[PDB]
């Protein structure tokens, strides 16, 4: 189908859904690498990794929502790094 | 570590929706909810008692904490349920 | 020395699906790397505080509750992991 | 009117709430009225979210509340949404909502 | 640089107001607003002067902060002119309307 | 007991303009003055409502600076300089 | 007169008062003797950090006396204090002079 | 009727800038700042004690709270200064 039609269909599909969208094992290796920077020989309960993953995905989706409103504000349909940077500035995540 | 209210949540579910069940993952959410709200109201009841140099948390601190923490319309309902319960407990008691 | 670059394990399609969940219709190619940067900063912040809780408790295993507490420190309350 | 909850007309546990207020470093003393009022409010708010989550279940022809329904309930209710504005429901998803400008 | 358009005047006004610390809303009108708003919630309420001053410092800091974000939103849209839709974007991302 | 009315209009165009200038704003649409009034009125109502809740809890009739500072904490804003 | 706890710890901030304030807040059933010492030490350090920066800002502007404006300039120009104090309003502090570059003549 | 720390803030100002005075408004800001940071650190130390089922706030809870609350170098320097204070107090 047309790429705009495909996107919109993907939106409807991913909005009905609750599954985590990042691969479980890649996320887990990321968490382990970051933790090892702070303290070596740290282990994670598997439900600690799941908590991190649920929060990270929630965070990123919330951020994409704001990013999107920033794009639409500038009369674009396409999100760009400047949309992320604006949202994070107003959110107070960066100064 | 955190308190479990599963039995009570379930009893409340049977009053409001008698023919609906709840998954164990949804019960986990509900527990996190009761604990969170408990901690918010108690922490505010505690700040209020300290602010007013009272060594006791009474139903008055709880009530004021509820009005502070809940949005206005929802606080009405909650204050009214709290007051009812205290009136019943205090009446025939 | 060793290449530690696991942020790159987070894939273009994972990022695209999170964006679609956030209602995004079209995504510039530059957003993937940008996103990986923001996610890394988020996770560094949370994990730094969670291991702080773990170490304070003289444990070597990070628990879900350590993460729940670390999230509260970022102003985020996560439900579902107290059991 | 046998247990402290029963006397208060409540399902939520008054004795247990009193105990938790005492162990929590909240004040030197906790009067008898405090755990009654706190339990009633906890019970009321629980019922609000179950009413609404139950309704979301029934809208999607389910008979069992899952995290999804809790998320829908909260996010569709202006008051619960304000109360829980910084809360993440694990496995909750988001509200189906596409900005009008993006539709053909 | 450029010479005295409204542009050049606005810029001097920005420099002037970012340099000073004084409150920018007239105090008696602010107090009257506070008292009017408090007439709903309760009859026969009084306000310490420093309470009204606390309300003013907080209100003005809140608006100035909100105007900062609003400006970034106008600039994002390639405008120098702030509009209500800029305020509304800012407030939404801040979570004040969400 | 005079009935006060319409005092939001005491938040004038020049006051609002001076606030936006401090906020670094170069140019201002004529529609932002009413928008700003609306935003200020909501913020103030929310704060004053929590301030009075503190005051009434303490069984006072006079709202203090500390009642305000506590109310502001409830909005997640910490105000310095009024603890005296 | 016995030697103050502050003297013994090498501090100006009051260790004794800090211990009483910790007990008066009901933060815990017991407060250990090192707690107020470490706490006073931190409060004193952070105070020293700000007053240093603010004293500087007061000089950078030909003044002999710290006003709220200098505290505000101190805090907002410092990456860490700015973060620490991100939700704080300093009464009579004003804002940092800063205009967006796009708004300025080229 | 928040705690006043004026005397001590004066003593610190004289150590750091023997030169400079401080207005009473500016002093009010410093008092708010001390009370605010005290409450953040004690509130966190209280949560830590409770999480770990300890009846007791020690300098360990204070330290951890400082690490949680303070950013970057500020935390490191404040951790060092607390540790010094406790070492000197314990010695004397
Ligand atoms: Cl979260
Ligand atoms: Cl576009
Ligand atoms: Cl860009
Ligand atoms: Cl960014
Ligand atoms: Cl009571
Ligand atoms: Cl009833
Ligand atoms: Cl994939
Ligand atoms: Cl795309
Ligand atoms: Cl939980
Ligand atoms: Cl009971
Ligand atoms: Cl002024
Ligand atoms: Cl008046
Ligand atoms: Cl404020
Ligand atoms: Cl323009
Ligand atoms: Cl508009
Ligand atoms: Cl007008
Ligand atoms: Cl203009
Ligand atoms: Cl204060
Ligand atoms: Cl003392
Ligand atoms: Cl003592
Ligand atoms: Cl400076
Ligand atoms: Cl500039
Ligand atoms: Cl100790």
From Swiss-Prot, chain C:
The nucleosome is a histone octamer containing two molecules each of H2A, H2B, H3 and H4 assembled in one H3-H4 heterotetramer and two H2A-H2B heterodimers. The octamer wraps approximately 147 bp of DNA. The modification N6-methylated lysine is found at residue 1. This is Histone H4. The keyword Acetylation applies. The modification Phosphoserine is found at residue 28. The keyword DNA-binding applies. The chain holds residues 21 to 103 of 103 of the full protein. Keywords: Acetylation, Chromosome, Citrullination, DNA-binding, Hydroxylation, Isopeptide bond, Methylation, Nucleosome core, Nucleus, Phosphoprotein, Ubl conjugation. It comes from Gallus gallus (Chicken).
Curated annotation (Swiss-Prot), chain E:
The modification N6-(2-hydroxyisobutyryl)lysine is found at residues 19, 27, 42, 85. The modification Phosphoserine is found at residues 20, 49. The modification Phosphotyrosine is found at residue 4. The modification Phosphothreonine is found at residues 43, 70. The modification N6-methyllysine is found at residues 19, 27, 42, 85. The modification N6,N6-dimethyllysine is found at residue 42. The modification N6-crotonyllysine is found at residue 19. Acetylation is generally linked to gene activation. Acetylation at Lys-85 (H3K122ac) by EP300/p300 plays a central role in chromatin structure: localizes at the surface of the histone octamer and stimulates transcription, possibly by promoting nucleosome instability. H3R2me2a is present at the 3' of genes regardless of their transcription state and is enriched on inactive promoters, while it is absent on active promoters. Belongs to the histone H3 family. Core component of nucleosome. Nucleosomes wrap and compact DNA into chromatin, limiting DNA accessibility to the cellular machineries which require DNA as a template. Histones thereby play a central role in transcription regulation, DNA repair, DNA replication and chromosomal stability. DNA accessibility is regulated via a complex set of post-translational modifications of histones, also called histone code, and nucleosome remodeling. The nucleosome is a histone octamer containing two molecules each of H2A, H2B, H3 and H4 assembled in one H3-H4 heterotetramer and two H2A-H2B heterodimers. The octamer wraps approximately 147 bp of DNA. Interacts with HMGB1. This is Histone H3.2. It comes from Gallus gallus (Chicken). The chain holds residues 39 to 136 of 136 of the full protein.
UniProtKB/Swiss-Prot annotation, chain F:
Its main location: nucleus. It comes from the Eukaryota. The modification N6-methylated lysine is found at residue 2. Demethylation is performed by JMJD6. Monomethylated, dimethylated or trimethylated at Lys-2 (H4K20me1, H4K20me2, H4K20me3). Monomethylation is performed by KMT5A/SET8. Trimethylation is performed by KMT5B and KMT5C and induces gene silencing. The gene is H4-I. The modification N6-butyryllysine is found at residues 13, 26, 59, 61, 73. The modification N6-lactoyllysine is found at residues 13, 59, 73. It is found in: Nucleus; Chromosome. The modification N6-acetyllysine is found at residues 13, 41, 61, 73. There is a cross-link at residue 73 (Glycyl lysine isopeptide (Lys-Gly) (interchain with G-Cter in ubiquitin)). The modification Phosphotyrosine is found at residues 33, 70. This is Histone H4. The chain holds residues 20 to 103 of 103 of the full protein. The modification N6-glutaryllysine is found at residues 13, 41, 59, 61, 73. The nucleosome is a histone octamer containing two molecules each of H2A, H2B, H3 and H4 assembled in one H3-H4 heterotetramer and two H2A-H2B heterodimers. The octamer wraps approximately 147 bp of DNA.
Swiss-Prot record, chain H:
The gene is H2B-I. The keyword DNA-binding applies. One of its GO terms (molecular function) is structural constituent of chromatin. Coiled coil: none annotated. Core component of nucleosome. Nucleosomes wrap and compact DNA into chromatin, limiting DNA accessibility to the cellular machineries which require DNA as a template. Histones thereby play a central role in transcription regulation, DNA repair, DNA replication and chromosomal stability. DNA accessibility is regulated via a complex set of post-translational modifications of histones, also called histone code, and nucleosome remodeling. Has broad-spectrum antibacterial activity. May be important in the antimicrobial defenses of chick reproductive system during follicle development in the ovary and egg formation in the oviduct. GO terms for biological process: defense response to bacterium. It is found in: Nucleus; Chromosome. This is Histone H2B 1/2/3/4/6. Belongs to the histone H2B family. Keywords: Acetylation, Antibiotic, Antimicrobial, Chromosome, DNA-binding, Isopeptide bond, Nucleosome core, Nucleus, Phosphoprotein, Ubl conjugation. The nucleosome is a histone octamer containing two molecules each of H2A, H2B, H3 and H4 assembled in one H3-H4 heterotetramer and two H2A-H2B heterodimers. The octamer wraps approximately 147 bp of DNA. The chain holds residues 34 to 125 of 126 of the full protein. It comes from the Eukaryota. There is a cross-link at residue 88 (Glycyl lysine isopeptide (Lys-Gly) (interchain with G-Cter in ubiquitin)).
């Amino acid at each position: 189908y047309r790429p705009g039609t495909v996107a919109l269909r993907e939106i409807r599909r991913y909005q009905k859904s609750t599954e985590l969208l990042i691969r479980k094992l890649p996320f887990q290796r990321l968490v382990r690498e970051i933790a090892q920077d702070f303290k070596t020989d740290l282990r994670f309960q598997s439900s600690a990794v799941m908590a991190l993953q649920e929060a990270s995905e929630a965070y990123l989706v919330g951020l994409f929502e704001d990013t999107n409103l920033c794009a639409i504000h500038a009369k674009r349909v396409t999100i760009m790094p400047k949309d992320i940077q604006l949202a994070r500035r107003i959110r107070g995540e960066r100064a | 570590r955190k308190e479990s209210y599963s039995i009570y949540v379930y009893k409340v579910l049977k009053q409001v929706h008698p023919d609906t069940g709840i998954s164990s993952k949804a019960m986990g959410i509900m527990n996190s909810f009761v604990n969170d709200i408990f901690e918010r109201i108690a922490g505010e009841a505690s700040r209020l008692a300290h602010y007013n140099k009272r060594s006791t948390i009474t139903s008055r601190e709880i009530q004021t904490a509820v009005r502070l923490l809940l949005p206005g319309e929802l606080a009405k309902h909650a204050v009214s349920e709290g007051t009812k319960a205290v009136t019943k407990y205090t009446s025939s008691k | 020395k060793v290449l530690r670059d696991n942020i790159q394990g987070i894939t273009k399609p994972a990022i695209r699906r999170l964006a679609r969940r956030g209602g995004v219709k079209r995504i510039s190619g530059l957003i993937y790397e940008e996103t990986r940067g923001v996610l890394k900063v988020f996770l560094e912040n949370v994990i730094r505080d969670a291991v702080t809780y773990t170490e304070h408790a003289k444990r070597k295993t990070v628990t879900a509750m350590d993460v729940v507490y670390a999230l509260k420190r970022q102003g985020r309350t996560l439900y579902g992991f107290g059991g | 009117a046998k247990s402290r909850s029963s006397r208060a007309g409540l399902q939520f546990p008054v004795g247990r709430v009193h105990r938790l207020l005492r162990k929590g470093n909240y004040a030197e003393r906790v009067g008898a009225g405090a755990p009654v009022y706190l339990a009633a409010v906890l019970e009321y708010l629980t019922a609000e979210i179950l009413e609404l989550a139950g309704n979301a279940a029934r809208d999607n022809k389910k008979t069992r509340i899952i995290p999804r329904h809790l998320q829908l309930a909260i996010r569709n209710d202006e008051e619960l949404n304000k109360l829980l504005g910084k809360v993440t429901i694990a496995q909750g998803g988001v509200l189906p909502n596409i900005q009008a400008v993006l539709l053909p």
